[model samples]
Target chain A: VGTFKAKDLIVEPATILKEKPDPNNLVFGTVFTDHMLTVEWSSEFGWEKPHIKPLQNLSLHPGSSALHYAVELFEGLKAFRGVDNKIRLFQPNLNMDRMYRSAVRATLPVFDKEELLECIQQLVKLDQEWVPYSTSASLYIRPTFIGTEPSLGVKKPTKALLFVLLSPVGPYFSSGTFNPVSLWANPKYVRAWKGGTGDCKMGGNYGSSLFAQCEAVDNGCQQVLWLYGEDHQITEVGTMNLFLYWINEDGEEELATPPLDGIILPGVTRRCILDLAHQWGEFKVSERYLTMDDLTTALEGNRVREMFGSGTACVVCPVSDILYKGETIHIPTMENGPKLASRILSKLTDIQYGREERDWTIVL
Target chain B: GTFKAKDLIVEPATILKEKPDPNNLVFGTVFTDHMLTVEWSSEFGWEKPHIKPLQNLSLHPGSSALHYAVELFEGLKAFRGVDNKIRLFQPNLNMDRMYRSAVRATLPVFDKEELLECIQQLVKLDQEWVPYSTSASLYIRPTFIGTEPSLGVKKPTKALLFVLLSPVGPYFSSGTFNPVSLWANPKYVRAWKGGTGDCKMGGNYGSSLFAQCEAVDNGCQQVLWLYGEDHQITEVGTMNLFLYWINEDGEEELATPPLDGIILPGVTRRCILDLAHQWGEFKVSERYLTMDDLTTALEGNRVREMFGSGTACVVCPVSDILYKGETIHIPTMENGPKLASRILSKLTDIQYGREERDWTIVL
Candidate 1:
């Protein structure tokens, strides 16, 4: 089908808007704005006019391909109210690009990225009051695409729906501090495989990771440090891309993360961190494989500096320990002040809230 | 939550839609007029079951099924018999597997027999949708989905179970037993230990579309899914694989990969194993078989037949396998697929009520 357009969008305001939640008492994805945007596509008749209507339940066929086959993908981004009382989006173009790639991988209908961004911006502006005035919270934007084909077959969907929801969320860590998390690394489960859809933002990828996450929680860890292959290659930490700063085998200061070799998500926050590190030119920045053995070697030598995770939810979350192979390996990121993660977090947040006034934030 | 069929509610459709042409029936597109649905919640337990006109479900935007793939499904068929009786072929097997899958996916478990009774009622209400021809049958899809509106990845507090009926034609084109060619690639693993591959969850199938596309591009009909480092042939497409060959011990055997945490427990696969073991003619094995073992068997001319078993296709003959840059030609069709054909004939006879076995549940 042809792509959807923003100019052809139809708007119907809500008859009675719900009261906004207190910014200080906000949950991650529990509260929603008054309106939503939806666009339908079908192989028989191309894309339909985009609709911005009252937020309500979706009427989907019982045999919708998304319900039966997991033919769905989604993107998470945020709209922040800047210190100067203006709304801005942080790296939304990157989210849109990633969403388009995810749609292609899912065989769902794709739309013009610029047009969708324009439509999303319109939605955020219409619900501008919902964007929290506090700096620690923002309006989380979730753009979801799903196959609505009324069939049970495992084939390309004929009908699809693209919709967006806005939920005001507080910070990832509620205590207003860079709380470090412990990771449980077990080889019993795999978050992804070589030929799987791990690189895409598919719903199945997240769903399959829940079991491993529960196991991690049961093991007294806050998140799962996903491992892959015989070498125990570190893929990710929970839903975030992992990073490690340590002294390398050649005895050089280095900051490294797993390469995007089809088994890791190409997260926007991950990209931003890499860019910032590259810009700083402070130490060796490498996108290479990090294995458990490599970490053990550095830890035994007392060469490991800091380890953390990067994602949109938690801009930078430090790792305090890793429970691996029946042994608890303590990481001294907090003891060392986690200088790099703190700096990166501050720089990104400043840019996001328009305090630093970077091009990454698109003001409306 | 306790599921009860005693509290069933029937909402008749105001106007029924016209049925599709049976001769041109597709796989899962056209549906019957009515469907069965049951709702559940952590707070309310299981609600009353409803058999109403087929319609769309109003779900929250943040339903767990849509985001976390907290969903599962099962497939079986209702056959119109030679005596004009509708029968379900050992639906208890499907129910057993569905209950297990529900538990694995962290969904609510239900009484299997109660759910089967509800399905029977729904099928009876839409009995006209069952195709008259012996080759075409009504495909029953029992789907369970997590309906929690929260975005958390934990177990869903709300859920739904529903059944749909779709009239489907035979898997083969024009009812001919043309064999299929498979592309065997070990890089793309279908299932693995500690995964939901053994369960009939939606997560298992969506991740396989890419490999299926690769198989087609490499000039094959379906993917011959391999697992582990030794390249064990676990399944073919969505069906369990059956290899009838002579083993190293020189025994004629009907062998399939065992359900060792990676193989889906299929009803059709179970029937074939049962039938073969019941005949007592050859060895029936649920064992592991690697590509190297198959290669040796093919080289020694010990392969008798190779086929796939599933609900959609009772038995699909596999003629050749494209693996490791060479075509491993299987002589299934060359020898008339004797074993595959015999099994298919027997299963169809039982399903269509021509043999009148206990497997058939007549309605």
Candidate 2:
């Protein structure tokens, strides 16, 4: 079943239209580029004609299963341009692998992973100019797949479509560095449960989150800190996985994040920080379920050093305060408590921008 | 906030050249005849215009909130031509109440009960063609409302669309009744806790049944039972409820299923219990959480009767059972223990066709 294959056919690059804007003014998920990559997959055929085409509207039937049953999934990552004028992607293969798993879980069509990777590389190479030169701004790559079957009934769809778009933007918080965002914690609304598709980046997860997100916004919080069960075990912060740094009673520095329960999405950024912490060999990094009670105890004992959310957009966003149980608990901003989150962000960004020669960066 | 309505504008009808062969037919959802309907709302204006064209599509892309699921609906019955010709049972008030609900749901962009009433009249005027000759056939309805808005988001916008059609044929079986079928365990999933299972409307119940119907086709009988907890017995066979008759302590006759909140409000379920217990003056009309109680009673020979209740089809005759551990048990089929269910069906049908005088059927 294996053979050496020729390189994929590559399309000529189109003339680039550059937008001159201050990197600090940019917002997340806005400002896209000229071209995008697309590939089609079918059950009978593994992967069909791949194309690097101009970004355009996807003409889909109104009765598509994805529209009805929320059979859509996506991944978000970024491409950074370093000081040496070199464009690089940080652990792009992890995103590709996650996309494959998402497609399989959603029961949409599947494709060859190597071919999909090649298509992504071609698109990234062509649109390398769109990657912002500033450290804060990077080309955000969004790989999306949806069920495209046109029918009124519910079943496993036979046809599906997969495509990728590139949007270059600034950090999630454009105004300043390490702005501590507030979180609304509630357990009345459960985001994901055991045996549910919370781990996969399914569109149903996002659609179900809209109401809760609106509630957070209504209550003057930027994001919702999703808690599960009566115990209020922390699952995720908004769309990102969360990590906390604290000192235990045994006098050892510890960093803890939720384990790979079926309900928590396994973020690539999250894995990167854990691996980096292991490489550092200084602090204790534990992968386990962290509860709100544990967090409150750490805060009360002055043992909670820092907290931040990690994802493709922000890389690492420091959490300043949390609104829990009708009270706002504020974390002190003195002595730069977010130093660890900042350092991890810089290390990952350095690898992404090719400033640091690591096994993570792939220069396509 | 009150005003008199004006006369409706009716469109010419287009009759079909031939009817589908009823023998090799599917379920009763397959529709026939020119559909009758109107649209209404609270904002913009009411009774601005009303027309009943031939059964065809009439919609615009930017017509407010219908696209985003701001909708409400009701389902009722229309009988065939009997001894006197044409008849409809309590149809006027059903339309009236649905209009009231549409207003409360903020789904209507126009408000005109007369337009809806006119549509019902149009259907009655053409009632000579009702399939009364067939013993099992009757007319079924699907009344739906949606906001026709372009902007895609929540919040009920100021617009609404309503349409009605009659599905002609038998609701379930063609000739004789199929007693009962078992549904799969609730663990495999159908509806979920705190979800929209209680709504009789389409969006909540439509897609879920596809998988359940597949389970039915696999020879498991009806989706034997569903529950929120482990086998809590929420619903059975897409009907409003599953009812089992048990002699409690050999003195009391008790029947029960879980209370509403997770159950569809079936019109037929309310009507049958009201009529049956009043006629017999027997032990009836109560709600309770049913679980292993009914099943254990069946095992101990204390459970005497079992049936499912719904509209379109009145009552289903259940004959056997299948449970969680792949165990199959057969109920009494020797003499058809569905005496009460059958009697209720005949009485309702007679009143529907004006052959019997009862408050259940209002002509």
Best by TM-score: 1
For residue A175, what is the lDDT in candidate 2?
Answer: 45
| Regions of candidate 2 where Cα sits further than 4 Å from its true position | A1-24, A30-54, A82-89, A123-128, A248-252, A332-336, B1-174, B177-230, B235-241, B247-291, B302-325, B330-363
**Candidate 1 per-residue lDDT over residues B180-282, each given as its tens digit:** 9999988787777756788888988877777777788888989999887788998999999999999999999999999888899899999999899999999
Q: How far is candidate 2 from the true structure (C-alpha RMSD, Å)?
A: 7.1
Q: TM-score of chain B only, all predictions?
A: 0.97, 0.79
- Return the top candidate by DockQ: 1
What is the lDDT for A338 in model 1?
85
Per-residue lDDT tens digits for candidate 2, residues A21-116, read 567777655456777776655555555566777665555543444544555677777788887787777787888788888766666666666777
Cα-based TM-score, every candidate: 0.94, 0.71
